[PDB]
């Protein structure tokens, strides 16, 4: 059993092999595409209010399996159990939210054409192929699947190969809810299987959450096949603290933003950009708060951090730490792989990080904070924008006039002023630059995979 | 002078070489990108009401050169002069329409977040690279440039190599209007130059109007570079006539839809799908009406059709005609290349066209109507959707409820019921399947190239 023939689940806290699953064969892929096509054909004809009711059924079936799902998330990728439980609750609440607010967003639009001759309709597009990651194994699927299916599309999940136990449980939830065959489906396809599906006429569009490299590989294939794609490819979000900040609130938001989900968050606070006058006080408070975080067995609710999800990615992250230290940064906390069977990396703080260093230019997808000193607010904006990424950003300053101006100039898709960054059904999510393009949640996640259709009567 | 080194204009009505222009060099490309970056940096700071006034200045500058522009359009690609004049009028009115209605579409959205803490802002993305075709040398450019620039983006035009006289005149109009260099810019880039610009960080996104082959080549590169693209790649629009249609109006709309711009329209009526009871009457009327169209010198206003734009594309169209005849269709009108120096192809009607034939499966980008018989309305819908394309469609029937149900089942981005298909600033434009993805005009054209940005204050 090698990762060249199988999807493999390993518990990152213990090292034990949980499950293996061979890649989908040519028959498996063809069967899934046939059922997706048949399911979409029938699903697109359903009434919107019936689909809204089915979303609520998904929410009930998810809550009914809430602890089983949370434990599967924790077991396969190491997330603290209360964060996994929160992920389940957030995902079930998303079902109910789109059931209530989604239908109105799909109503026909009036136009300025005289005599009400023309309207805009939001029609289903087809089956959307979804390529998803391990860090929120449930929420990442539901964030797209819920509005996509509400809009009359089908959804075909290609999940990360280390969370196929989560993928099977999600399928069971959709089965429990009575979602027809082919409307929600999933496949353990290897990269070639994905390539084959992108080229297949029964896949209408593609959505990807993952690495920049995956986004570039899949986006190129989608474009070559004339398939629209949405790409969410991670981030290196700046977290700016100016001299007049509420320092106690800023440190709390800084610690939560960097170290939630053991740092494995696309929109984690990854680059702390601190104005010079407050930098010493921020750094000392931040290091002390990070050092008080309890880490260990993620089934134990006293622990705020678990192990990292993937052994090879802990090696990558530690290598990023070593290079950054070799480049001249200072190690203030952590910075060594923990011995033992678990994939643990301690909360880590690097300081004296300059724009040329590895921890400033690459996504640090684990519990490693990078602290950079800014000379003033204009330098802080320049440092914040000096990134290939552009997902989200935080600004802490009590000057509301300065905050709003920096938001208008921050090169990212979401700006949080004096608060905690998060994704939320009620607001758009997604970024710019190498973080990708397209928007999820609110009405944006509904409409991205609609056929927006002008219907015009009696144009004579 | 060779096609490997130069853009070349030839008058299709006479075969006379008009002009040549060498491809941009490395220095030209870098200068255009530097201008674009400097122009966007300043333009994004302007007030939206200022930009709206600048749109009005564009409309004024364009009308002031309306006849110079129209004659250049007709001279370079063969369009009947009054259709070229109408193209100018429609483009100038688009400037005024977006100046009046655009700014309100760019206001921040409220959200359902508590305490009015979060809004959605529509920020510009950057410089949009636009790859455009020769069939509407002005309107294709303005359709995107006007909303793109209004949203605070820059626009960098790579026009079709046979209309660089048009491209130069468009640049002069923007300069007459006082639109800064780089905010509207253009380059005579070859394909490699386009590839270099797509990879350059000073290009934020790409928009393409052209062939399926061009959209696949460019879309693949945009995806590989993590740049959003919008693709409009032509169509094979069905035109459905049921037994209860207003037959006189249906034939008029049928003829106008197929033969406008000598057939060279993405959203032309290309596949006529006629219910069996009315098929003989429709076909007789349609052949007679098409045979009454005058073709010749497009400077002479008595002509409804001109020569086709490109000699090689007349050859391609006639090859598609010959293959369709060889497969079993019946030639009712035209069907032969005219002798002489001009690139003339007569109005042509193919009957007994089945879904397996070349004229049913490929885009027929010239004055060639295909007529297919449908047994009933359900067969008509199946025939209409049996296409790799999906741009627009027409339904003629007095059963207004049947029309509405068929529209909800047509796999295309626009459906015209008992009327003339057209693009219009007030409604969405763009299709599905191999016709591409993304939407132009109305608020869609403004928002496709925005950074849709969540700004959320005090999330604590
Ligand atoms: N944006 C995010 O939420 C997110 C999530 C996980 C990882 N990441 C980033 O990616 C890095 C690596 O983690 P990863 O290896 O799991 O990321 P990954 O991109 O390799 O995995 C993401 C998903 O894309 C699929 N995938 C990757 N390459 C593919 C290809 N060529 N064809 C088809 N499918 C393909 C994977 O199977 C998985 O389902 C992390 O350190 C982090 O920086 C980002
Ligand atoms: N959608 C439309 O409105 C439209 C317009 C013109 C042509 N077409 C279709 O395309 C057929 C051929 O006409 P055409 O040869 O002018 O189409 P074309 O796609 O080759 O030309 C379209 C534009 O794209 C550019 N282009 C093409 N390939 C490119 C590449 N690889 N890299 C960079 N730029 C590239 C061309 O220079 C031109 O500016 C027509 O017969 C018709 O079927 C469609």
Cα separation of the two ends of chain B? 67
Q: Quote the CA–CA distance of A222 and B436 in Å, as a whole number.
A: 11
The terminus-to-terminus CA distance of chain A in angstroms comes to 67
Whether residue A81 contacts residue A298, with contact meaning beta carbons closer than 8 Å, is answered with yes
- For the CA atoms of A318, A322, A327, A330, the dihedral, rounded to the nearest 10 degrees, stands at 90
Q: Is B441 annotated as a binding residue?
A: no
Judging by DSSP bridges, how do beta strands B450-457 and B118-124 pair with one another?
antiparallel
Give the Å distances, CA to CA, from A378 to A110, A373, A392.
Answer: 44, 12, 18
Q: What domains are there in chain B, each with its CATH number?
A: 6-233+435-456 (3.40.605.10), 237-422 (3.40.309.10)
Q: Which of B100, B104, B250, B451 to mutate to test the interface with A (most CBs of A within 10 A)?
A: B451
Spell out which residues of chain A touch residue B215, defining contact as CB-CB under 8 Å.
226
The three-state secondary structure class of B110 is: strand
Mutate to test the pocket of ligand 2, among B210, B262, B359 (most ligand atoms within 8 A of CB): B210
What's the 3-state SS for A253-290? HHHHHHHHHHHCCCCCEEEEEEEHHHHHHHHHHHHHHH
Comparing CA positions, the residue from B417, B77, B412 lying closest to residue B264 is B77
* DSSP character at residue A434: G
Is the distance from CB of A447 to CB of A440 less than 8 angstroms? no
Cα–Cα distance, A233 to A216 (Å, whole number):
9
**Residue whose entry in the numeric block shows the structure tokens 């655009």:** B102
Cβ atoms within 10 Å of B264's Cβ, excluding its own: 24
Let me know how many helices (H) and strands (E) chain A has, helices first.
15, 18
Q: From A221, A220, A173, A226, select the one nearest A201 (Cα to Cα).
A: A226
A253 to B227: CB separation less than 8 angstroms, yes or no: no
B180-208 b/e (C-beta count within 10 Å ≥ 16 → b): bebbbbbbbbbeebbbbbbebebbbbbbb
Task: Retrieve residue A336's tokens.
Answer: 């060594």
Task: Give which of B343, B259, B328 is closest to B296, Cα–Cα.
Answer: B343
Catalytic residue among B76, B232, B275, B440: B232
Closest CA to B190 of B316, B310, B21: B21
B363's tokens:
């885009």
Q: Which of residues 400-419 of B touch A (CB under 8 A)?
A: 400, 403-404, 407-408, 411-419
Q: Which of B118, B123, B220 has the CB atom closest to A223's CB atom? A: B220
- Ligand at minimal distance from the CA of A314 is 1
> Where does B210-353 show beta strands of DSSP type E?
228-232, 237-241, 269-275, 330-333, 348-351
φ, ψ (nearest 5 deg) of residue A196:
-65, -40
Nearest chain B CA: its distance from A223 CA (Å): 4
Is B439's CB within 8 Å of A430's CB?
A: no
B429 and chain A in contact, CB less than 8 A: yes
The number of the ligand 2 atom at minimal distance from the alpha carbon of B366 is 41
HSE, side-chain direction, 13 A CA sphere, residue B104: 4
Distance between CA A302 and CA A92 in Å, rounded? 25
Sheet holding A237-241, edge to edge: A330-333, A348-351, A368-374, A269-275, A237-241, A392-396, A414-417, B450-457, B118-124, B109-110
Q: Which of B452, B458, B460 to mutate to test the interface with A (most CBs of A within 10 A)?
A: B452
This PDB structure is determined at a resolution in Å of 1.8
| Cα–Cα distance for residue pair B50/B39, rounded to 1 Å | 15
**Under a CB-based contact definition with an 8 Å cutoff, are residues A157 and A186 in contact?**
yes
Q: DSSP secondary-structure letter at A407? A: H
| Spatial contact of A245 and A398, defined as CB atoms under 8 Å apart | yes
Q: Which residues contact A432 (CB under 8 A, 6 or more apart)?
A: A390, A411, A412, A413, B125, B204, B451
Length of chain A: 460
Whether residue B338 contacts residue B309, with contact meaning beta carbons closer than 8 Å, is answered with no
* Helix residue ranges per DSSP H, B11-80: 26-43, 48-64, 66-77
Q: Is B134 annotated as a binding residue?
A: yes
Question: If we measure between CA atoms, which residue out of B368, B356, B40 comes closest to residue B205?
Answer: B40
How many residue contacts between A and B have a Cβ separation below 8 Å? 198
Q: Is B110 in CB contact (< 8 Å) with chain A?
A: no
Closest ligand 2 atom, residue B140 Cα = 3
A373: helix, strand or coil: strand
DSSP characters for A301-363? TT-SB---S-HHHHHHHHHHHHHHHHTT-EEEE--SPPPSSS-----EEEES--TTSHHHHS-
* C-beta of residue B205 within 8 angstroms of C-beta of residue B125: yes
Q: What order of strands is seen across the sheet that includes strand B436-437?
A: B184-186, B154-158, B127-131, B205-209, B228-232, B436-437
Answer whether A94 touches B (CB < 8 Å). Answer: no
Q: Which residue, B350, B356, B333, is CA-closest to B270?
A: B350
Give, in order, the Cα–Cα distances in Å from A159 to each of A7, A13, A86, A138, B414.
Answer: 10, 21, 20, 10, 35
Residue B135 marked ligand-binding: yes
Q: Where are the alpha helices (DSSP H) in A209-269?
A: 212-224, 247-259
Cβ–Cβ gap B220/A220 under 8 Å = yes
- H-run or E-run covering A408: helix A400-409
For B212, nearest residue in chain A (alpha carbons): A226
Q: What number of other Cβ atoms are within 10 A of residue B16's Cβ?
A: 11
Residues ≥6 apart with Cβ < 8 Å to A53: A99
Residue A433 contacts B where some CB pair is shorter than 8 Å: yes
Please report where in the chains the tokens 């029937």 appear, as a residue. Answer: B397
Nearest to B456 among A113, A416, A438 (CB): A416
CB of B4 within 8 Å of any CB in chain A? Answer: no
CB contact, 8 Å: B26 with chain A? no
């Amino acid at each position: 059993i090698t990762p060249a023939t199988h999807a493999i689940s390993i518990n990152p806290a213990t090292g034990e092999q949980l499950s293996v699953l061979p890649w989908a064969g040519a028959d498996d892929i063809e069967n899934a595409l046939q059922l997706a096509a048949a399911g979409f054909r029938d699903w697109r004809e359903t009434n919107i209010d019936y689909r809204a009711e089915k979303l609520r059924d998904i929410g009930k079936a998810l809550r009914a399996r809430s602890e089983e799902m949370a434990q599967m998330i924790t077991r396969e990728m190491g997330k603290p159990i209360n964060q996994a439980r929160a992920e389940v609750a957030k995902s079930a609440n998303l079902c109910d939210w789109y059931a209530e607010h989604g239908p109105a967003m799909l109503k026909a639009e009036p136009t300025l054409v005289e005599n009400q001759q023309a309207v805009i309709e939001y029609r289903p597009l087809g089956t959307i192929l979804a390529i998803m990651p391990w860090n929120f194994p449930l929420w990442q699927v539901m964030r797209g699947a819920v509005p996509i299916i509400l809009a009359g599309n089908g959804y075909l999940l290609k999940h990360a190969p280390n969370v196929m136990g989560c993928a099977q449980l999600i399928a069971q939830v959709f089965k429990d809810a009575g979602i027809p065959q082919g409307v929600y489906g999933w496949l353990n396809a290897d990269n070639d299987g994905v390539s084959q599906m992108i080229k297949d006429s029964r896949i209408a569009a593609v959505t990807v959450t993952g690495s920049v490299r995956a986004g570039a590989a899949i986006g190129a294939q989608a474009g070559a096949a004339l398939k629209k794609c949405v790409l969410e490819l991670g981030g290196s979000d700046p977290f700016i603290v100016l001299n007049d900040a509420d320092l106690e609130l800023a440190v709390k938001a800084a610690v939560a933003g960097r170290y939630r989900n053991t740092g494995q968050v696309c929109a984690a606070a990854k680059r702390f950009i601190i104005e010079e006058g407050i930098a010493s006080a921020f750094t000392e408070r931040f290091v002390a708060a990070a050092a008080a975080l309890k880490m260990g067995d993620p089934r134990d609710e006293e622990n705020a951090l678990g192990p990292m999800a993937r052994f090879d990615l802990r090696d990558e992250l530690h290598h990023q730490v070593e290079k950054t230290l070799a480049q001249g940064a200072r190690l203030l906390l952590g910075g060594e792989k923990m011995a033992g069977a678990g994939n643990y990396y301690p909360p880590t703080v690097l300081a004296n990080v300059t724009p040329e260093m590895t921890a400033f230019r690459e996504e640090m997808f684990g519990p490693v904070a990078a602290i950079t000193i800014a000379k003033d607010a204009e330098h802080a904006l320049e440092l914040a924008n000096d990134s290939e990424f552009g997902l989200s950003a935080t600004i802490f300053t009590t000057d509301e006039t300065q905050a709003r101006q920096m938001a208008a100039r921050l090169e990212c898709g979401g700006v949080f002023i004096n608060g905690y960054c998060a994704s939320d059904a009620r607001v758009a999510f997604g970024g710019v630059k190498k973080s990708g393009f397209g928007r999820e949640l609110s009405h944006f996640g509904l409409h991205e995979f609609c056929n927006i259709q002008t219907v015009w009567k009696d144009r004579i």
